[PDB]
Structure 1
Amino acid sequence: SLASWIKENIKKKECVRETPTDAFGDISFGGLGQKTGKYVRVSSDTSCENLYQLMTEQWKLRSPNLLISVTGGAKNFYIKTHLKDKFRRGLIKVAQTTGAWILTGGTHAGVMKHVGMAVRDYTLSSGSMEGQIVVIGVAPWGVIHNRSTLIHPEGRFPAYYSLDEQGQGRLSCLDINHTHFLLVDDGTQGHYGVEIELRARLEKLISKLSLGNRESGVTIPVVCVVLDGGPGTLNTIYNSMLNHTPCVVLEGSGRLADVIAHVASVPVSKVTMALINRLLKRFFMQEYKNFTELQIIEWTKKIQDILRMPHLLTVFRIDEDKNYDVDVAILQALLKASRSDEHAGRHCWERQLELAVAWNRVDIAESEIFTEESQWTSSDLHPAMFSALVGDKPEFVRLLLENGVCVREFLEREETLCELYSHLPSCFFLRKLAKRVQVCLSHVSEEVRHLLGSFTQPLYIASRYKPDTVWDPGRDLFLWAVVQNNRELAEIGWEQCRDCIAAALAASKILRKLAQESGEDDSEEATEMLELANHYEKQAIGVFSECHSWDAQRAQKLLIRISPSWGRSTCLWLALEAHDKSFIAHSGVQALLTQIWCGELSVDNPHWKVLLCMIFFPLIYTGFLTFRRDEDIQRQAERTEQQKLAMESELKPLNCSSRLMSFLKSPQVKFYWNIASYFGFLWLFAVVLMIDFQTSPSWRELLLYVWLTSLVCEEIRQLYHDFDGSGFRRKAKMYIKDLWNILDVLSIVLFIAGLICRLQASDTVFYIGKVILCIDFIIFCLRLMAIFSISRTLGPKIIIVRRMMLDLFFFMFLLSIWVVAYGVAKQGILIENEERLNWIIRGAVYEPYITIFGNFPTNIDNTLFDISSCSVNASDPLKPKCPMLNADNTPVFPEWLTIMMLCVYLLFANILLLNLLIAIFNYTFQEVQDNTDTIWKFQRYELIKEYHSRPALPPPFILLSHLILFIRGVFLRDLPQRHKNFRQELEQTEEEELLSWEAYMKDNYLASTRQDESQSVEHRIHDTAEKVGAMSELLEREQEMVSATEEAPHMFARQLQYPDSTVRRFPVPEEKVSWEVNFSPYQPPVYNQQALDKHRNPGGRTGIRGKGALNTLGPNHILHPIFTRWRDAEHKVLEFLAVWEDAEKRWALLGGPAQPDEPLAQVLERILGKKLNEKTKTLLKAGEEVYKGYVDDSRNTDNAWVETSIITLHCDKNTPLMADLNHMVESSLSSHQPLQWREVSSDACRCSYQREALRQIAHHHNTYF
C-alpha cells in the first residue's frame, strides 16, 4: 500500500537533475530469519514534513522520546575488553526502556559494527516481545558494494541479501544487525561525505518534534556520543555545542576521547598551543607524528574553546567506582545540561520533572528530584500527576502519591474530572459512551446507571459537583480506574476509598455486567474482566471476615447500612444482585439471615419446642422458648457485674402483654400457619370434589371459590410491594424465569377454565368441567413438593432428580423401537392378514409392551387354541385371529422357536438396557456432590424475603388484611416500615466512627496478606535466586579491583567565527593572548565591515583586524543607567525598570549607546523617550558609578572594542520621579514592547555584563545584615 505513496512523492537524483525515486522494499538477511529491515532511498534535499511522516506514520514506528546520536571513527578501533561490555549493556539499557531512537552511519565499518554487536547480543536475550529497539541508519546509495541485489523501480519486497566485504575500496558494505535504513543520493557514486548536512538538519529539526503533544512546550533532548573519531569528528561536536541544545558525553577508550578526557582535568586558561601539542603528541603517536602543523593552531584553540562551557560535558572517568552502567551517566548528564538554559526560575524544577514523566524510568528522576533538602507543595505537582494518570504509568503515580500529592486537593474542581474522562483508551465502555454521545458528566452517569441497575440513583449531577449526590474524591478515581480494565491503577485506587466493602462489590457487579454484555472481543472479556471481578470478590470477603472476627454486633450494622456514596443502595443488595455465590456463603451473613428469619424470638431454640408453643398459646407467656430481649438484658447485667467485680478486687426493658403480639409476626410462625392452611385447602378441595359435587353450588364450593381468589390476591400484592418496585415487568421477568412458577401459572388459569365449564350448565359440558378440575387437583398437590425444598436435608435431593429428567424420554424411545420391532415380527410370522386395525395395534404394540414387565414363567402364555377364533373373518367379541394351522390343533411354526425368540428378546430387554439407565444416575449422583453447598444458601435468601412482606393473618383471612392494606393505601398517606430491617439509614456520628473503624480494619488486612505472602516457599526461592545472581557478578568485579594492583583572557572575542559575516578570525591561544608575548606566524586577515595601526586592544590579541561594524576605531562606549526603586512599601524586595525586547524575549537593561563627549541628559532623553524631563531634572543628582571599563563581546577586534560605564540610581520607597516616567512607559522605542519595573535579585544567570552589576547591587544592599 505504501508503494502508491512511495512512488508518487519521493524523488531521486541522477546525471544535477531530479527524477522519481526507486529502490524500495524490505531487506531480509540470510542468516537469522528474525529480521526484516526496510530500505528506502532519498535525495540530497527532501521535504522535511514528508521525511518525518515517512519516519513516523508510514513505517508504524512509534513516537520518538529521546534522540541519541553515536558518531565518530568510521574505520576501526580496539577496546580493552572490560569497558566494551559495560558500554554495550548500557547503550542498550537506555534505548530499550525509553523508546529512544539511536542513529548512526549504517555501514559495517567500525563504530556501527559495535552498535550492531550490541543489538545482536541483546536481541537473542530479550526475545523481542514488544517495543523493538528502533535503530535508524544513514548510508549513501552509491557506495554499497553489492548494489544490484535490490535495485528495481517496482522494487522486490521479500528481497534476500548476502554479506560480502572483499570488494572494499571506494565502495563500502552494509551492516548486519540494524533495523531501518535511510539512503541518501548525491549523484556521485565515488563520494563518501554526502550524508552530513541531512543528518545535522534532521536532528536539529526533530528536536522540536515534541511540541503541541502535551501541556507544556519543552523540547525533546538530543545527545551526541562519540567514542573515537577523526579530524572531522570535532566539528560536529562544536556545531552541536554551538547549537547549544545537546549535551555531549565522552568515554575513556578512544584516541580523541582520551585527548578530551586528559584536557578535561587541566584548566581552560592553561591550554596553550605548545601545551596542547605536548598533550596530543602522546595520544595518537601515528598521527601525532603525522600532524599537519598548519591546522594545529585551530585544534588547540578549538579545544580551548570547547572546554569553556563546563556543564554540557561529562565523562565516564575510566569506570571510577561503579557508577552503574553508562545508562545513567548519560541520563543524568542530560538533566545536568538541562538545568542551565534560557529559563531563570521555578520553571527549572517544573520543566525538569516532565522529562522524568515522559520516560518510563523512575529511579534516576526520583533520586535527583526528591532529595531531602528540597521542599514541595501539593498544588505544584498536579500537571505531572495528570500526565502520569493519562499515560497509565503505575509506579510513578504511586511515587507521586507517597511524596505529597493529596487526592482531596487534586480533584477540587469539576473541570479536571471532565478532562480526565477525555482520555480513555479504547474499550467496550468507550464504545458504549460513543453510542451515548450520538464530555459533560451526565453522559457518564447515564451509562453507569444502566450498568449498575435501574434501582439506584444517578451518581453525578451537572454543575453541582461542589457540595443527593454527595462528593467523595475517592470513588471518582476508583471508578475511572475500574471501567477501563486496568489492574495496576485499580489496586492503587482501592486503597484510597473511604468505605471499602460497598466499593469492591460495586466494581464486581460493573465488571460482570460489562463482560456479559460485550461477547465479541472474546479474549479480553473472557479472561481479564472475569479474573478481575473474582479478585475484587475475594478482596471483599477478606475485609468482611476480618471485620467479623473482631466484634460482630457492629459488623452487622456495617453490612446493612445505606451507603450515600454509591447512590443510596445498600451493600447486601449489591452482592445479592451480582450473582456472587462466594460472598453470600460467608458465615456472618448466614447468621444474619438466620437471625432475621427467626424473628423476634431468639435463635438456637429447637423446633419441637417451637411447634409445641404454637400448639398452646399461653405457654409462650409462661415461658418455654427463650427471647432475645431478656437474653440481652441478662448479658448486659452480667457484663456490668463483671466490670464491677474487676473494679472491686441502651437496652430495652421487657414488655409483658405485647410479648404475644410480637411473637405472632415472625416468619417461622407464618410459614407454619401457611402450611397448615395449605393442608386445609387440600382437605376442603377433596371433600368438595368427591362428596359435595352437584349441578348447583353449595356453601362449601363458595368457600372454595373465595379461598382460591384469596391466594391469587396475596400473590399479586406480594408482586408490587417488593423492592425494585418502581417500574413494570422487571419482577415479572424475574418470576416467570424458573420452572416452579409454571405450575401456579398453569393452575390458576385451568381452575378458571373449570369454573366457566362448571357454571356453563349443559348436558355434556358439566362432565368435562368436572374432568378439568380433577386434573388441576393433581397440580395443586404437586406444588407442595417445592415447598418442602426449604429444609437443608431435602434441599439438594430434589435438584438431582431435576437434573436427569431429560435422558428418560430418549431412553424410552430407544426401548420402544425394539418392542415395536419384536411385536411386528411376532404377529407377522404366524398370523395371516387381519383386516382389523384395532387388533393389529393391540397385538402389535400393546401385547409386547405388556409382556416385558411380567414375570418370565408367567410370560410364557403360548398355545395354539385357547380363545382365538378364526373360521369367521374376526369373531367380533374380543377374539383375535387364530394362528395358522397345518395339522389340526397344531401350530405350523414350532413353539420352541417362539420360546427361544422370546428368551433372546427378554434377555436383551432386561439386563442390557435398564441397567445402563440405572448406571447413568449413580455416576452423576456421585459426581454432583461437591458444588451443592452454595446454591442452597442463595435460594435461602430467595425465600426469606417473601414471608417478611406477607400479612400476618392466615390465607383464609388474607382477603380482609388485603382489603385493610388497600384501605390504608387509599388514605393517601404512605410511610411504610417495609423492609425496616433491610434498609437502614444511620445518624451522622455513628456513620463517621463506623467508617473510620472499618478503614482501620482494612489497613490491618492488607498488611496481613503482605506478611502472609512473603512466607511462602514459591516466593522465597525466587528471592534467593536473585540474591545469588547479584552476589555472583559482584565477586567477579571485586576480583578485578584487586587485579588492578582567574579567567584572565577574554573569551567572547576569540570566537572562531566572526559575528554576522563569513570571514573567520585567526585562531588565538590563551598563552599568546596578551600583547606581552609575540606569536611568530601571527597574521590576522583584515576585513572591516562594509589607519588600522592607530590603537591596540587593551584586552589582548583577537585575530581580527579592521573596524568591525563600528563607526570609529578604538573604544566604543555605551552607558547603562539603571532606574531602580523598591518593589513594595514594606521594603521586602527591590525592582528596576528594565526592558524586555520583542525580538529576544529577554529581561535586558535600559541603556543605549553613549557617544564620546555626549551629554547625559540628552542621551537619557534619547534612550528613555523623555516626553517629560522634569522628573529626571529633579533626579539628575541620583546615584551612579556601578562599574566602568572593558567589556568582552563577540564584536571586538584588534583595533575596535567595546567599553562601558554602569550606573545605578535607586530611589527611595516612594520614588516621586517614577510616576511621570511610568505613565509615559509604553512601546516607545519599538524594540521592547513590555517595559516595567521587574523585581530585581542577585541573579548571576542573566545577561553577562548585567549579572555582575546586579551581583554588586545585591552585594551593596544585603551585606549589611
Structure 2
Amino acid sequence: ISVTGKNFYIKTHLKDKFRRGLIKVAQTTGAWILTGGTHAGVMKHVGMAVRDYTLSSGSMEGQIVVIGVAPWGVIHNRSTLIHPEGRFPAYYSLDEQGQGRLSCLDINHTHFLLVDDGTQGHYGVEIELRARLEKLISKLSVTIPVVCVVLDGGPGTLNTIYNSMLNHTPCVVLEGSGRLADVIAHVASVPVSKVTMALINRLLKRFFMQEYKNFTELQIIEWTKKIQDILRMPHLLTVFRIDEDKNYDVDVAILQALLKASRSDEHAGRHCWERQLELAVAWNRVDIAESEIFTEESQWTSSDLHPAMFSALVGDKPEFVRLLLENGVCVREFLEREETLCELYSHLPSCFFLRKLAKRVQCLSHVSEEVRHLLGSFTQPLYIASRTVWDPGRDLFLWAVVQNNRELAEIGWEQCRDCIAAALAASKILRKLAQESGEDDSEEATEMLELANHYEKQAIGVFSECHSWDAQRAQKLLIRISPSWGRSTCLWLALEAHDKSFIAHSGVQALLTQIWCGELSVDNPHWKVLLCMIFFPLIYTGFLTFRRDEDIQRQAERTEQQKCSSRLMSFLKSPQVKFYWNIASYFGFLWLFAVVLMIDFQTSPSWRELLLYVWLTSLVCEEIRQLYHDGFRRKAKMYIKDLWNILDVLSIVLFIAGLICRLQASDTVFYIGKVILCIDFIIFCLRLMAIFSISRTLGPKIIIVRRMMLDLFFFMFLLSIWVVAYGVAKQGILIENEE
C-alpha cells in the first residue's frame, strides 16, 4: 500500500477514522507501506500513526516496514550524511525550522531511498522512479496486490496518480479530503462532456480557495489533459465515500479496488482469486466476499478452499466459516491428513486448557491423557497414534468446545453425527473444567457453566422429540454403546456427569422403573410386592402380572386391530425382591450381632458368635465378588472411590482387628476387643442409615466435610477462648495469690 496524499486541513473526525483504519490494515497482513519521506503533512501523519501502533504492540510481532523515497536535493542537512565511509549511525537535526524550500525527513519512518538527479531545487524529478519501484515489487511473486490511497493533494498528487495508473497498479481516492480528491470525486459522470477547461476551471475555483491565483494557462492545460487521461480508465480508479458507521472503512475500499482491477483483467481468474480470498479472511468482511466472489458463475472445487477456511477457523471467524460450509467446504474431506489436526492443536490460542496441557507436555496422542483425565477415566482412550474410529465431526467439535469458542462450537455440533453422546460429553468436560478451575477467572467460569447448561438443554430437547416420535426405539437409543467417543454410553455418561435435568425426564424414568421392576410387571403396587414377599406360594395365587403375559395379551390385540420352577426363579431374579430380601437379612444381622455383643459373650466364643463370624465371612465374600466383577490396582482404585464400599472396608477391617484381639488372654485386651466390636456395631448401623439418604458420591461430601469442620473448629475456638478467660478470671477473684 502506498499513500501519496504540504498544506492540508482535514477535520478531526476523518483524521481519526483514517488513523484507526490504516492501523487496522497495518496490523493484519504484514504489509509494506510506501510514502514520500518529507515530514511535512500527511507523511508525518502516517509516521505518527505507525509509531503509535508500534508502541501499542511492544515490538512483539511484525515491525511494519515503512520504506520511504525522497529527493536528495530537497532534504535539509545532507552534508551531515555525506561521508564516503559506510555503516555509521548518523544523527539528524529536525528542529522544525528549515528553510522554505528544504523540508526534512520524518524520523518515524524506517527505510530511506534518496534519489539524486542533481537538480537540487525541485521536488518533481524524484517520482518518475518511484512508481517504477511499485511495478518491480508487483513483478515479484501469483502476484502481490498493489494499491495506492489518495488524500487532499495538489500538483504532486496528480502526477503520482497519473504515473501510477499508467502502470496498472490501481488507486483509491478518499472522499471529503479537500484539494484534489474532492475534484476527482465530483467527476463521476459524463466522460466526454465533463472534460472541458471551463468545467475544470469552475471546479478548481470552487475548491482550491487560497492558491487559485498561482495558476497559469500551461499548467491548467497540462492538468486538464492529465485528468482526462486518468478518468478515461474507469476500471482502475475508484472514488470512495467517507468512512462512516454504516459498515464502511478502508478495508472495503482496498478490497473493492482489488476486485474492480481483477475483474476486467486479462488473466486474473486463474490465480489471483486465491490471494484475494486469503486476504479477505483476514479483515472479517463477510458480506463483501459473499456478494462478490461467491457468485453463481465461478464453479470452484471444494478441496482448494481448504487453506483459506483453515485460517478462518484458526482465529474465531464464525459467520465466515458458516459461509464456507454453505458454499461447498465439506468437513469430511477437510481432516484427511492428520498433520492438519496436529497443526490445529499447535495453533490453539490461549485458554485454561493449554495452560493445563503444557504441564503434561513438559502430539495428538498426547491430548487423550488430558481428555480422559478431564473426562471419567472409565472410558477407553481415543485419538490413536495412527489410523479408534476416525469420525471427523467428533474431532472438530471436541477441538471447538475445548477452546470454548461458543458460536464456533454450535457449528461444531450441528455438523456432528451421534448427537446426544457428544452433547452430554461436552457437558461433562465443561462441568469438569468448571470445578477444576483453580485460578479464579469468575466470568470465564460462569461462561463455562452457562455453556454446559446450554448443551444439557440441547440434549434433552433432541431426546424429548425422539421420545415423542417413538417409544421403544428411544429405549434402544439410551442403552447404546458408542463406536465414536470411546466406550461410554449415554445413560452412564449423564449419570456420572450429574446432569440433573436430563435423568429427570419422563422416558428415562420409565426405563429406570422398567429395569427396577424386572421380569414382573411395571404397573402393580409395592404393597402387593411386600405381601408376595410374605408368603412364598402366594405368587402362584396372587394377581402379580408379568412382562411375558402382559406383552402377549398386548401383542395379540394389536394384530386384531390391524386386521412351576422357571416362573418362580424369574420372580426371584428381580432387583426389588432382592433388595427387600437383602435388607430383611441385614436387619436380622443387626439383631443377632446386637444380641451377642451383650449376652452370649464368654471367654471362648459361643454358638451364635460362630454364626456372626460366618455371616461376616459371607459379607466379605460378597464384597470380593463385587470387586471381582466390577490394571488390577486400577480396579481397586476405582473401587475405593465410592462411599458405601469404603464403609464396608472400614467395617470389616475393624471387625477383624476386634476379632484378632478377641483371641487373647489378658483382660485389658479382652475389654479392648469389646470396645472395638461396639464401635463397629455403630459403624454398621450408620451404614444402614446411609443406605437411604447418602449417595455414592465422595466429592461434595469431602467439600461439605471441609467447610463444616471449618465452622465447628472456629466456633469451638472462640468458645474455647471465652471459656478459658472466664475460668481464669473466676480463679483470679475467688482465690488468693497462692495456688
**TM exceeds 0.5?**
yes
Question: Is the 1:96–1:132 contact (alpha carbons within 8 Å) kept by the matching residues of 2?
Answer: no
Flag the 1:513–1:635 CA change in 2: closer, same or farther, 3 A: same
- Show CA shifts across 1:1085-1120 (max 9, x none): xxxxxxxxxxxxxxxxxxxxxxxxxxxxxxxxxxxx
SS in structure 2 of the partner of residue 459 of structure 1: coil
Distance (whole Å) between structure 2 residues aligned to residue 77 and residue 165 of structure 1: 18
Distance (whole Å) between structure 2 residues aligned to residue 727 and residue 508 of structure 1: 28
Flag the 1:531–1:129 CA change in 2: closer, same or farther, 3 A: farther
Flag the 1:803–1:80 CA change in 2: closer, same or farther, 3 A: closer
Question: Is the 1:478–1:490 contact (alpha carbons within 8 Å) kept by the matching residues of 2?
Answer: yes
Higher Rg of the two aligned structures = 1
SS in structure 1 of the partner of residue 90 of structure 2: strand
- Show CA shifts across 1:59-86 (max 9, x none): xxxxxxxxx5443xx8556899999999
Question: Is the 1:252–1:316 contact (alpha carbons within 8 Å) kept by the matching residues of 2?
Answer: no
Distance (whole Å) between structure 1 residues aligned to residue 245 and residue 682 of structure 2: 94
Question: Is the 1:788–1:794 contact (alpha carbons within 8 Å) kept by the matching residues of 2?
Answer: no
Displacement of 1:442:
3.3
Distance (whole Å) between structure 2 residues aligned to residue 523 and residue 162 of structure 1: 53
Displacement of 1:394:
1.7
Flag the 1:202–1:737 CA change in 2: closer, same or farther, 3 A: farther
Structure 2's unaligned 5+ residue stretches are none
Question: Is the 2:150–2:171 contact (alpha carbons within 8 Å) kept by the matching residues of 1?
Answer: no
Distance (whole Å) between structure 1 residues aligned to residue 408 and residue 84 of structure 2: 51
Flag the 1:454–1:746 CA change in 2: closer, same or farther, 3 A: closer
Flag the 1:186–1:768 CA change in 2: closer, same or farther, 3 A: farther
Displacement of 1:710:
0.7
Question: Is the 2:73–2:120 contact (alpha carbons within 8 Å) kept by the matching residues of 1?
Answer: yes
Equivalent residue for 2:487?
568
Question: Is the 1:268–1:308 contact (alpha carbons within 8 Å) kept by the matching residues of 2?
Answer: no
Equivalent residue for 2:3?
70
Question: Is the 1:70–1:224 contact (alpha carbons within 8 Å) kept by the matching residues of 2?
Answer: yes
- Show CA shifts across 1:259-297 (max 9, x none): 767888676999999999999899979988755567778
Question: Is the 1:247–1:334 contact (alpha carbons within 8 Å) kept by the matching residues of 2?
Answer: no
Equivalent residue for 2:17?
86
Flag the 1:327–1:821 CA change in 2: closer, same or farther, 3 A: closer
SS in structure 1 of the partner of residue 304 of structure 2: coil
Displacement of 1:620:
1.7
Equivalent residue for 1:496?
415
Displacement of 1:403:
1.8
Distance (whole Å) between structure 2 residues aligned to residue 486 and residue 146 of structure 1: 56
Displacement of 1:718:
0.9
SS in structure 2 of the partner of residue 380 of structure 1: helix
Flag the 1:148–1:240 CA change in 2: closer, same or farther, 3 A: closer
SS in structure 2 of the partner of residue 377 of structure 1: coil
Distance (whole Å) between structure 1 residues aligned to residue 247 and residue 288 of structure 2: 12
Flag the 1:633–1:327 CA change in 2: closer, same or farther, 3 A: same
Flag the 1:782–1:447 CA change in 2: closer, same or farther, 3 A: closer
Distance (whole Å) between structure 1 residues aligned to residue 63 and residue 433 of structure 2: 34
Work out whether 1:612 is the aligned partner of 2:501: no
Distance (whole Å) between structure 2 residues aligned to residue 715 and residue 672 of structure 1: 19
Flag the 1:132–1:586 CA change in 2: closer, same or farther, 3 A: farther
Flag the 1:151–1:766 CA change in 2: closer, same or farther, 3 A: farther
Distance (whole Å) between structure 1 residues aligned to residue 380 and residue 720 of structure 2: 60
SS in structure 2 of the partner of residue 161 of structure 1: coil
Flag the 1:638–1:805 CA change in 2: closer, same or farther, 3 A: farther
Displacement of 1:299:
5.4
Question: Is the 1:338–1:352 contact (alpha carbons within 8 Å) kept by the matching residues of 2?
Answer: no
CA-atom RMSD in angstroms: 7.0
Displacement of 1:669:
1.0
Question: Is the 2:643–2:698 contact (alpha carbons within 8 Å) kept by the matching residues of 1?
Answer: no
Distance (whole Å) between structure 2 residues aligned to residue 680 and residue 335 of structure 1: 89
Displacement of 1:577:
2.6
Flag the 1:598–1:153 CA change in 2: closer, same or farther, 3 A: farther
Flag the 1:335–1:733 CA change in 2: closer, same or farther, 3 A: same
Name the structure where helix makes up a greater proportion of residues. 2
Flag the 1:737–1:167 CA change in 2: closer, same or farther, 3 A: same
Flag the 1:367–1:99 CA change in 2: closer, same or farther, 3 A: farther
Question: Is the 1:223–1:246 contact (alpha carbons within 8 Å) kept by the matching residues of 2?
Answer: yes
Displacement of 1:598:
2.6
Distance (whole Å) between structure 2 residues aligned to residue 667 and residue 373 of structure 1: 68
- Show CA shifts across 1:1208-1258 (max 9, x none): xxxxxxxxxxxxxxxxxxxxxxxxxxxxxxxxxxxxxxxxxxxxxxxxxxx
Displacement of 1:493:
0.6
* Bigger mean CA deviation after superposition, 775-784 or 397-406: 775-784
Displacement of 1:496:
0.6
Flag the 1:754–1:363 CA change in 2: closer, same or farther, 3 A: closer
Give 2:651's match in structure 1, choosing from 732, 747, 755. 747
- Show CA shifts across 1:40-67 (max 9, x none): xxxxxxxxxxxxxxxxxxxxxxxxxxxx
Distance (whole Å) between structure 1 residues aligned to residue 212 and residue 706 of structure 2: 99
Equivalent residue for 1:102?
33
- Show CA shifts across 1:12-43 (max 9, x none): xxxxxxxxxxxxxxxxxxxxxxxxxxxxxxxx
Flag the 1:285–1:782 CA change in 2: closer, same or farther, 3 A: closer
- Show CA shifts across 1:104-152 (max 9, x none): 7799977689999999999999999999999999999999999999999
Question: Is the 2:517–2:575 contact (alpha carbons within 8 Å) kept by the matching residues of 1?
Answer: yes
Question: Is the 1:145–1:165 contact (alpha carbons within 8 Å) kept by the matching residues of 2?
Answer: no
Distance (whole Å) between structure 2 residues aligned to residue 522 and residue 219 of structure 1: 47
* Bigger mean CA deviation after superposition, 790-799 or 152-161: 152-161
Flag the 1:678–1:106 CA change in 2: closer, same or farther, 3 A: same
TM-score (structure 1 length as normaliser): 0.47
Distance (whole Å) between structure 1 residues aligned to residue 650 and residue 346 of structure 2: 54
SS in structure 2 of the partner of residue 182 of structure 1: strand
Work out whether 1:259 is the aligned partner of 2:183: yes
Displacement of 1:554:
2.6
Question: Is the 1:89–1:325 contact (alpha carbons within 8 Å) kept by the matching residues of 2?
Answer: no
Flag the 1:636–1:122 CA change in 2: closer, same or farther, 3 A: farther
Displacement of 1:251:
5.4
Question: Is the 1:433–1:443 contact (alpha carbons within 8 Å) kept by the matching residues of 2?
Answer: no
Displacement of 1:455:
3.1
Displacement of 1:102:
7.6
Question: Is the 2:520–2:547 contact (alpha carbons within 8 Å) kept by the matching residues of 1?
Answer: yes
SS in structure 2 of the partner of residue 314 of structure 1: strand
Distance (whole Å) between structure 2 residues aligned to residue 160 and residue 744 of structure 1: 86
Displacement of 1:409:
3.1
Displacement of 1:365:
1.7
Displacement of 1:709:
0.7
Flag the 1:304–1:171 CA change in 2: closer, same or farther, 3 A: closer
Flag the 1:202–1:531 CA change in 2: closer, same or farther, 3 A: farther
* Bigger mean CA deviation after superposition, 821-830 or 323-332: 821-830
Question: Is the 1:250–1:316 contact (alpha carbons within 8 Å) kept by the matching residues of 2?
Answer: yes
Work out whether 1:198 is the aligned partner of 2:198: no
Question: Is the 1:251–1:316 contact (alpha carbons within 8 Å) kept by the matching residues of 2?
Answer: yes
Distance (whole Å) between structure 2 residues aligned to residue 192 and residue 505 of structure 1: 71
Flag the 1:186–1:712 CA change in 2: closer, same or farther, 3 A: farther
Equivalent residue for 1:156?
87
Displacement of 1:563:
1.1
Flag the 1:136–1:599 CA change in 2: closer, same or farther, 3 A: farther
- Show CA shifts across 1:301-338 (max 9, x none): 65566566553223359999999788745531222113
Distance (whole Å) between structure 1 residues aligned to residue 443 and residue 265 of structure 2: 47
Question: Is the 1:102–1:134 contact (alpha carbons within 8 Å) kept by the matching residues of 2?
Answer: yes
Pairwise mapping of residues 478-877 of structure 1 onto structure 2 (< 5 A)?
A: 478-514=397-433, 519-520=438-439, 522=441, 526-640=445-559, 643=562, 658-721=566-629, 727-730=631-634, 732-733=636-637, 736=640, 743-761=647-665, 766=670, 768-770=672-674, 772-789=676-693
- Show CA shifts across 1:77-108 (max 9, x none): 68999999999999899889999988877999
Percent of matched pairs sharing the same residue? 100
Flag the 1:733–1:206 CA change in 2: closer, same or farther, 3 A: farther
Distance (whole Å) between structure 1 residues aligned to residue 382 and residue 705 of structure 2: 46
Question: Is the 2:3–2:150 contact (alpha carbons within 8 Å) kept by the matching residues of 1?
Answer: yes
Distance (whole Å) between structure 2 residues aligned to residue 735 and residue 460 of structure 1: 27
Question: Is the 1:501–1:543 contact (alpha carbons within 8 Å) kept by the matching residues of 2?
Answer: yes
Question: Is the 2:19–2:46 contact (alpha carbons within 8 Å) kept by the matching residues of 1?
Answer: yes
Question: Is the 1:250–1:257 contact (alpha carbons within 8 Å) kept by the matching residues of 2?
Answer: yes
Flag the 1:167–1:775 CA change in 2: closer, same or farther, 3 A: closer
Give 2:117's match in structure 1, choosing from 172, 186, 197. 186
Structure 1's unaligned 5+ residue stretches are 1-67, 211-217, 644-654, 834-1265
* Equivalent pairs, count: 737
Flag the 1:687–1:828 CA change in 2: closer, same or farther, 3 A: same
SS in structure 2 of the partner of residue 804 of structure 1: helix
Displacement of 1:367:
0.5
Question: Is the 1:104–1:138 contact (alpha carbons within 8 Å) kept by the matching residues of 2?
Answer: yes
Distance (whole Å) between structure 2 residues aligned to residue 193 and residue 155 of structure 1: 29
